[PDB]
Amino acid sequence: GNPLVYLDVDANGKPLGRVVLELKADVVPKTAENFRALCTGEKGFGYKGSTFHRVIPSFMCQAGDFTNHNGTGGKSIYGSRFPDENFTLKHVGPGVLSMANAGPNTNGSQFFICTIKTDWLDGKHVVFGHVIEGMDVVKKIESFGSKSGRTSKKIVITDCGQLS
């Protein structure tokens, strides 16, 4: 079945809760496997201890830059970047999990969780999952963002992994 993974998130060292995500390995197996492996840390690197570096209320919460912690880094389990797998899944609403990028075929490790429908990203960002549980946790993260994307507290994925 599709992986179920989790991110345990804190704000300045205080726990906000758990976000549980389904990864659509059935539609985007390579993108799903990348994220799954970065949650478990099984390749020797990943998301544990990294931050939500860009959080824009009424838009999305962005994370996964585990090298530079600011949107300029990250890498995949494959290499520094990998191709856009397909654009089959769309940005249909809040809770969509999608790859951040710097243009075509630049996926690494950065990702975003949508807090609104972001349909203008369809065909540009590879959607690969959605929130199963903890949209209230996403909403708390969203609360610490700003229109500039800068966060008012340090938002940290303190643990992460695979449930099934």
Ligand SMILES: CCOC(=O)CNC(=O)NCc1cccc(-c2cccnc2)c1
């Ligand atoms: C809502 C999603 O928004 C975005 O993706 C907007 N764009 C960014 O944030 N770009 C920053 C970004 C995102 C993903 C990969 C890279 C990258 C690629 C290659 C080498 N180094 C870094 C950069």
Ligand SMILES: [K+]
């Ligand atoms: K805007």
